[PDB]
Each structure stands twice: as C-alpha cells, then as structure tokens.
Amino acid sequence: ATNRDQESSGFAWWAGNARLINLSGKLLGAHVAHAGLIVFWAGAMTLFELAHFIPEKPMYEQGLILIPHIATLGWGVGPGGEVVDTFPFFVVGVVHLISSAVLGFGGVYHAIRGPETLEEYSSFFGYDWKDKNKMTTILGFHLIVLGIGALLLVAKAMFFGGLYDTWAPGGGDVRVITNPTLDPRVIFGYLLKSPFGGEGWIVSVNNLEDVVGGHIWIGLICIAGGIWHILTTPFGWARRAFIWSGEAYLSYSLGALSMMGFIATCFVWFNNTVYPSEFYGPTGPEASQAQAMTFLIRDQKLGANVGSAQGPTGLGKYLMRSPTGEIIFGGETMRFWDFRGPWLEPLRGPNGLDLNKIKNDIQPWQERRAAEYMTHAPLGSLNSVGGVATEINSVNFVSPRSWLATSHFVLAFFFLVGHLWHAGRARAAAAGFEKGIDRESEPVLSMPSLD
Amino acid sequence: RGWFDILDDWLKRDRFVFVGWSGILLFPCAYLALGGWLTGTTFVTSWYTHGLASSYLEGCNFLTVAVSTPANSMGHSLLLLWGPEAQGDFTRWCQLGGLWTFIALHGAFGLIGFMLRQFEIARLVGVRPYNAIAFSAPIAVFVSVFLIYPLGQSSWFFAPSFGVAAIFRFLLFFQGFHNWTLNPFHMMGVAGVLGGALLCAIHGATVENTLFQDGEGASTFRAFNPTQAEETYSMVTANRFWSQIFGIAFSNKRWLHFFMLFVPVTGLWMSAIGVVGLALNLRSYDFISQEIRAAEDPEFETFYTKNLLLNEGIRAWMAPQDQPHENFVFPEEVLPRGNAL
Amino acid sequence: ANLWERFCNWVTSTDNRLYVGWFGVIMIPTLLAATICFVIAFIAAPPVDIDGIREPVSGSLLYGNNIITGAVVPSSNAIGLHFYPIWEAASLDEWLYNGGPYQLIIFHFLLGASCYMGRQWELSYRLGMRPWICVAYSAPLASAFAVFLIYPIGQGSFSDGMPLGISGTFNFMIVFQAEHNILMHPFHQLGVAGVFGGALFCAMHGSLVTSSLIRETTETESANYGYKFGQEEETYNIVAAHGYFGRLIFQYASFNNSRSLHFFLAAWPVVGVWFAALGISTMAFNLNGFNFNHSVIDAKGNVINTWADIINRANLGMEVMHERNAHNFPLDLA
C-alpha cells in the first residue's frame, strides 16, 4: 500500500489527500470520481426538483434552483416563463445521472485499480508538476474544452431554439438570438465599468445579444489561449514570478474560484436578465421598487396626485429625484433607483419615471406583477418562513436568489481562505521551511537586532 | 491514621474521575443542576408562571426550551419543595417554578464545588492555584446575573430563565430597559471577552507558525514530546515578527501567559460590577447634556438619541407579554411607532 | 545595484524596524488616509444625512458628541451603493452633508487591512516562518468586510454599513436584530461560542501555564524574571499542567501535546469568528435567524407563546421605531 500511512507519506489521515500529490494515477481517479459527484448531484437534484414540481405555481415558490437554469436556456417554457413541457427537465436530470455512473466508474477504477502513477505507463498522460511546458499543455487542453462549452451556449441561443428573454417585446418569451453583439467596444466595455451603484461591472449585462456576443468572444479567446499554451512554454518573467508546484497551482485556482464565487453571488442578487425573475423571483431591489409602485397605484386610484404628494420629510411620498435629477420612487427605495425591469420600464421616460405615463398608462399586468414581486421579496428565515424577521408562521418561502447568494458567499469566502492557506504553504514548501524553523539555522538569529 | 485519614485516602485515589473532599459538594450539586435543566426543558411547562410553553413535551425545540423563573408573585422565595408555596407537592412545585431556584441554587453550590476541586487538585499535584483564581470570573458572573440582579429587582421572575431563546430575551430586555450597551462596565466586559478571544487566536497561531522543525513529517504534531526540555517554537522569531508587523511584541513568556489570564478574567469581573448596579436600576441609561440639548433643539440628533427611540419601542412592544403580572393593556393608539411600520 | 534593485531590497528588507514589503506599499498610504480622515471627521465633521431624508445626524465631537455618542456617520441612502469620492461632489460642504468621509474611510481601511493580512504572509516568508498567522487574522478581517461592505451590498446602500462609532455600532446591532433575528441564527451562535470559548480557553491556557511555572525566582521578585527572552528550555512544566487539567476533568480531555493545544487555541476562535462573519454576510442577503413565531399552537388553535414569541415582541419594538421618518410603505424590504 504505497504511501497510505503517516510514517511513509509524512501526512496524517486528516491531510490524507495530500498523500496524492505525486501519484498521478490515483489523483486522476480522485478527480474523475469527484467530477462524478458533481454530475450525480446535478442529475439527482433535477429529478428531485421535477418530482416535487407543481407547474402552475411559480418556480420560486418551490425551492427550485436547477429547473430555473434549464428554463433560462429556453427549455420547457413559453411566454411569461410558463412551463409548457417538463420533459426537457427530465432529460437533463436523467442524462446527468446516467453520465455520473460513467465518471464514477472511471474514478473508482483509476483510484483503486489502475496504475498509481501514470508516468511509467504513458508520457502523454504522465506529468511532473514542475514540468512547466507539460503544465501549460494540459491547461491548454482545458481552455479549448471551456471555449467549446461557451460556444455550446452560443449554439443554443442562435441555432437550437434561443434563450428565455425576459426583455422580449410584448412580454418575456423564448427568443432566437440572430444579432449577437460582436463589437469589442461593447463587450469589453462591460469589463471596465465600475462595480459600484448604477454601473455594476459585468453584472449589469441586460440583454441577450450582449450575453451571446460575450460568449462568442470568450469561446474564441479560450480556444486561441489554449492553442497558445499548447504551443508555448512559460516566459522568463512568468518563471520568476510564480511558484511551480501542484500545491501552488491549486492555490491559484482556489483564488480564482473564490473570485468567481463572489461574482456569482452578486450576479444572482442583482441581475434579472440571465437570472429571470420569472424563474428566480424578484431581486431585492426589484421587490422594494415593486412595493412603491403598488402603493402609488393604490393611492392614485383613490385620488392622490402622486407627483405633488409631499411625504413627512419634505421629499415626495411616491416620487422624488435621484442625486442627478431623474424621477425615481421615494421612501427607502430611493437607494434602488438603478433597478431596471420589464414591468417598470414602460413607465420610464428620458428623465426617469414619467408622471403622464404613471397617471394614464399603467396596465393591469403591471399592477399584478408589482404586487407579486412586493409579496415575494427575498427576505425569509433559515427554516423558510417567508417575509420579515417578525412575520408569523404561514408562508413557506425563501427566495432562490437568497439561497444562491448566501451559499455562494460562504463558498467563495472559504475558497479565499483555502487560497491563502495553500498559497502560503506552497511558498513555504518551495523555500523549504513548511515543517518549521531549522533549530541550527534559525534565520532571525543571523539578522541584526531591530534595536 | 483514623477514619478521617482513611476517608481522605479513598477520596484522593488516582482514578478515571478524581473525587476529593470537594467532590462531595460538587458531584451531587452539578448533577442535580444539569439533571434539573434536562428534566424541565424536556417535560416542564411555564404556563402558570409566564404563560409560555417551554419543554419538548409541549412542542418547543432546543432553541426555545427553558426552565423559566417563578411567577413575580413568588418574590424571592427559596421555593423549597417542602416550603409554604409547594408544601411538598412535586407537581405543584414544578408548576410554580421550583425547578428554577433548584437549578440556580444547586448550580451555585456546584460552582463552589468546582472551584474547591481546582484548589484541591492543584494542591495534590503541587501546582500554583491560578486556574481556580481565574474561575472566580465565571463565579462573579453567575452570582451577579442569576442571584444579585433578581435580588435587587422585584423577584426571581426577572432573573434569566435557563434557556437559549430565554437568554436572548434577557439580552434584549437589558438593552430596552437598562440601555446596557451604554454601560462602561459592560464595555470593559466586551473588551476582555473579545480581547481574550483575540489573544487565544493570535497566540495559538503564533506558536503554530514559529514551530521548530522537529520531525520529518509534513504534519507537525507528532514532532513534539511532553517530556522534552526545549521550547517547541521560537520566541525570538515570534518576537521579531510581531515587533515588525504590529510594533510591539511579547518577549517574556511568563508575562504573556499571565496576561492571557488577566484580560478575560478582568473583563468578566467588570461586567459583573455593572450588573450589580443594574440590580438596582442604577444604569448608564442617559447622557444628561445630550437630553437637555435634544429637548430644546428638535434638529439635534445623534446615534445615542436614535438608540433610545429603539429602547422605547422594545419596552412598549414587549412589556405586556413579557411582564404578564402587570396586566398591561396598551391601546394601539399609544404604541410608539414611526411612519408606516 | 541599480535604483530599482536597491528600492526593492529596502522595501523587502528584514531589517526595517517596521516591515514595509509590497503589501505595505499599498497598506501604508491607504491606512494613513483612512486614519487621518477618520480623526478629522470624528472631531470636526458637520451632521450627515445618513437616511437620505434631509434629517442630518451629528457624529462629531465639536457638534455636540462625546466619545461614546460620536461617530463618522454612514453615507446617504440617496447615494446607495454609488461610489461617492470627493471629486463627485460639487463642494466639500456637499461632500460632508452626504457622508463622503465614511466612504473614503471604509474603502481605504478595507484595502489597507487586506494588505495588512498579505503583509503578515509576506513577513513570515522573509523570516522563514510557517505562513498561516494571516489566516487567523482573516477572521476579524472577514468580519469588518461583512459590516462595512457585504451588508451594504446586500441591502443596496452604504447607509446600512456599521457606523464608525461606539453608539452607532449599537444602533447597527439593534436594527440588525429587528430585521434578521440574528440572535436566533446559528452562525451568530457559533460566533458567540467562538468568542466566549476563545475567552474561556485564553483564561484556561493563561492560568495553566502560569500555574506550572518552574521556580526560578524569590518571593520578593516577579516570577516573570524567571524567564529570559530566547532561552532554549521551556519555562513551565507541561507534564504538571496536564497532570493538573487531566485530573480536573479526566485524563483524555486534557492535551499533552503543546502543538495540538496551540492549534486548538488558534482554531476554536478563528472558526467561530469565520461563522460570525458569514452570519452577517449571509443575513446580508436576508437569509435570516430561525423563526418560530407562533410555532406552538393548542388543540383549538390558540397560540401558546414560547420565548421565541417574547423575542419577537422586542424585535417588533425595534422594527417599528427605527428610522422613524424614513418608511412610507408598510414593509421594510431592505
């Protein structure tokens, strides 16, 4: 049993997987078995969601996170995001579940039966962490794989039925994207937008042409990059900047996944384009604005003149100005005036909310949607009692947006920690003092006193 | 070598669980305090004393179960099982809150037993009794909060009830009624608790990160031997590190470890002193200069005036259900509320 | 060496009284700016319209506060999450009215304190130490990020960031209780176990090491003189300490390995505090404490209150009173 105790490996059981660092065969098994676990969950969780699913309640009233992802791709839904066929969901679940058996088979085989190291077996599949060119080649294969993944999304949107478009003229619907945004000024312009309010960096993406165009770019960047890394070896300045070890590379990826986790958190919290409110529920900003809209409609029906109604502080009770003058809802939702959503936008003019439109053009479907969103705000308890923290038991609800934001924050946070842990460890191991200070060569002892 | 010394021998045998003369106080008192808590939280109501369900039997969960204080009309009755209230009736005694004084009083004697145990063991093993000395802080907290505080108030009803949610209620009561956050004795408590948690984290991390390489293993715990003479980590390197990161650093390990006793122990003792004042409603509730200014100037606002508005809401909204013996009826129209909410 | 080389050598020098380092080149100026602005604003800033309702709250000493009441007040709810640097204001007077110092301070501070953490890794590397002191500091750091950045992001405004001041801190806590029932949240409960337990273990370790110091001094001198900086020999007897504590409880509940003990001292508070930070950072997205309001119902359907319902009434008091002029609509949704 090669290296499967502390004496021989130098690693205790609780650091057991570090015993795998230089055993490329068993480590391939660990990786493939784990990819199995991810695929298993995607498949099983979907079947579970589908079994529990009542197609005439909103998804977001049903604790669903995976059906909403399938529906955003335009599968299984029609106008308004109404479920028209659950069979695409069943297919996604079954096919992942079946695929996980295969991955789990390969993982178990590599992990316990196959060759422990691959280097003797094959010079193509074997690798030395310290072989910079081999590391960049494998990285290159994976980049090409990822760019093909990104182009699968583009193929779905342009050639295989489209995507769910909450912004579609006349009402949300599945729509084929025929004119994806190619202009790099628009695509890369997102990357240079501020992440602060009213701007929101990439999270502000608000139309499927930009989404599809971005993935066209990203797919080509990733395939070009992958070819690059297969054809080159790292340059001198990169050689001198990094640590070249399995543990260092892990650290870099932990750092990157952490960053992606925080971004995903903000994406599901604020973005209502690639996370349609039809499927995920209203965003926090959306539901607060929907409350102001609800009472503006109510009191205006009763006779209030909502443009000239002064609230207790002197600011408009329903309507006021943003710091740059745009007309926006009043009360605490003043903070949310950068919110944009298909049910509100028909009321917006060049100067912000239009009082003429408010007085004359508000349709019953806007009243309904604002009422629905106001009463499904993403607030709720850990035991899924919907509403404010003092609300009574009655409504079983926590928004999928809160589930997805909180889980991803927690994950991103612990991944930053793992980044620091592994990056600091990789540095120390490379320099040779990860196990402690040499008592006969204690560096501080050869340094001058501070004073 | 009479019976006293023979008993002494037996009490002091080196066994899996040491007993001692202190064990005769400690074991029964601690067992009953803990058993009384488990018994009440599992089976016993607070319907007659508080108008609350408080046990698994009634449907509470681990967060909401409690053994609750007796009714306010009991005053500071010892509430002895054989006393004039329960008159020997175990059922009625449960219904009147007898388990509350049961747990608080055996708990108090049990803590005395525990501290005697720390003294007794230190003496037998031949170490200095600083662990017992440090334990005076838990004792000052228990005694101030569970005994002195209700003794200065109307009755045991206002002591904390033994329960997770119940203790949370006790925190929020102290905010709304005593403004206890404003009290510099509580603030010193906070600094010594958070300061002690800081010291715990930073010293554990420093030792673990200035370790000498004493084995070949990448898992470094095995490279220590209890009987070894040598320090397992470098004080000199640690000292340089913090001198250069933070500006100062420990250089004396005896001082370091004494300070680790001093800080959280001192914090707890300070918070206890503030709670003794609260027994008498002797609060740090207000800054008089602030109130005089705000009364005359309706544009003057600070976070201090804002928190008193919150306190006034807590008191008006919680008192009728939290203090049922007062029979409060507050018509909707008198309840303090801001706009809309 | 050339100029650049010499500069690098000085920056990364292990011989500077305070380590500078590359993290330090960002840390030094950002922390100085945050400090200077805080000090001046705390003393002399005019009132700030925190809730965007033209109701300015006085935070500074010269405008009627003492050390306990004073604060640098969060930026205006009218601003929300918009970036409000000095040059976005038409004037300093406007910048002050709207709470611009708060943003300048918390952004320079969070950047500088993140660099403080990197700098702890950096020095440990220069000195040939193990690297994870910085991972311990990530716990208070993560908590500062939760209250000054993540909570404002979730709620949509830096006006809901923790104020920089003693009373404003309590204000943030009480309102947080009203809106999330944090006390009933298990991540805050783990936090409490982390800091109460950190204090308990701090005192415990202090008292056990102190109890077993080896006699090296007379009674007319401090026993501290019994230890000399840099001596090779341990200064207490671990075997007597364990002999003590294993009998206090029982043998196997006591640590006989100092590395194990010290790791536990690091891990217990750090992990609890990571959960505290994560409680704040997930209540930022309104996944709130347990809600057992009216959970216990009798055979007819009467509500039988529990302590959770009494908590609920205190929370209602906070909710209805906070920011008493800011709400126009019946639900407080952020």
Partner: peptide, 30 residues
C-alpha cells in the same frame, strides 16, 4: 472643554504608541 479633554487623551495615547514602539526597552537574548 469636553472636546479638548477627549482630544487631549487621544493625542496622549497616540504619543504613547510612538514611545512604546520606537523607544521600547529592546528585547535582548541573554
């Protein structure tokens, strides 16, 4: 007078930090 007092105590504490760091008794291996 009160503001002066608060700022005075604060400025003393800042001075104290300066002396405690730069004018500390130096730690000596001995």
């Amino acid at each position: 007078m009160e503001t002066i007092t608060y700022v005075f105590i604060f400025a003393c504490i800042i001075a104290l930090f300066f002396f405690a760091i730069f004018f500390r008794e130096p730690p000596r291996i001995t």
